[PDB]
């Protein structure tokens, strides 16, 4: 286990045996792909192979090393104000839970229909000094599940978190991180959906009727400062203890908007990664 796990030799690939010639009836190279199945032909079948003892692990080819990597999924921003502190909808951020809200990683999952996981969340606040001294800028992140009082503005009554989670980070002390159970009323997170809100010819349809999990209302606790700032707290996300069901063809068209598939670009012709050739004859 150790060795196998430390040496990373858990999932090893078979070796390529030796072959000889075959002047025989059954032709393995011939199958009818219309059966929708996949061929089973190998080196040893087609050629006069040798003998190679392999030693490549398919460890890094596991839904956990494919998925289990932290990725920017949101960049909370706060261009503070000292003029009006508090006021409605200010100096505090709120953002709806999700992804589809950002490619590269969105891309990645979408490779599967259903998915399930606990996550390694990490907050990377970066304090840009627009003043001659930033002081001590404390911070409060927290989670607002449904249906819950989402701060109208900066000091509601909801920042008491008498029964909510609020993580606090003060300049110097390291990045806040933490983790989380798999939050869904369903046995898995619906990375897609072919359902609607209802029969209302104006109902919602997508990944989304099924993902009302939150939002995040933010706060820079410290009170009024002299010299201004702007905070940019980056939100990274990692999938730990993941499972996946029914793979899908990757995405080749740059999306737009989340919780939707829509590609149809604003005017520009739909572009894809495929390159053009002069002729099939020369590559």
């Amino acid at each position: 286990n150790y060795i196998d796990e430390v040496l990373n030799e858990v999932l090893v690939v078979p070796n390529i045996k030796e072959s000889h010639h075959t002047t025989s009836n059954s032709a393995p190279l011939l199958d009818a792909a219309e059966t929708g199945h996949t061929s089973n032909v190998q080196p040893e079948d087609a050629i006069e192979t040798r003998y190679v003892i392999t030693s490549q692990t398919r460890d890094e080819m596991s839904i956990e090393s494919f998925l289990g990597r932290s990725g920017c999924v949101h960049i909370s921003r706060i261009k503070v104000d000292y003029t009006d502190y508090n006021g409605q909808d200010i100096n505090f951020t709120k953002w709806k839970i999700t992804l589809q809200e950002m490619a590269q990683i969105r891309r990645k999952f979408e490779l599967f229909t259903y998915v399930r996981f606990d996550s390694e969340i990490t907050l990377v606040p970066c304090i840009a000094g627009r003043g001659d001294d930033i002081g001590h800028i404390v911070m409060q992140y927290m989670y607002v599940p449904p249906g819950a009082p989402i701060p109208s503005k900066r000091n509601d009554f909801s920042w008491q978190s008498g029964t909510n989670m609020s993580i606090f980070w003060q300049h110097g002390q390291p990045f806040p991180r933490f983790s989380i159970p798999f939050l869904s009323i369903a046995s898995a997170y619906y990375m897609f959906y072919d359902g609607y809100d209802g029969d209302n010819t104006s109902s919602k349809y997508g990944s989304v009727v099924t993902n009302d999990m939150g939002t995040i209302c933010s706060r820079i606790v410290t009170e009024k400062q002299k010299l201004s700032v702007v905070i940019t707290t980056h939100i990274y996300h990692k999938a730990k203890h993941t499972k996946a069901w029914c793979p899908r063809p990757p995405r080749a068209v740059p999306y737009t908007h989340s919780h939707v598939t829509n590609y149809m670009p604003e005017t520009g012709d739909v572009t894809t990664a495929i390159v053009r050739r002069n002729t099939i004859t020369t590559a």
Binding site: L11, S62, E64, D118, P181, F182, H241
Partner: peptide, 19 residues
């Protein structure tokens, strides 16, 4: 060094294993 789930909950733990 391992299996020392310093934290109570299971959701908090390292990347799972392989089998």
């Amino acid at each position: 060094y391992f299996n020392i789930n310093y934290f109570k909950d299971a959701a908090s733990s390292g990347a799972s294993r392989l089998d």
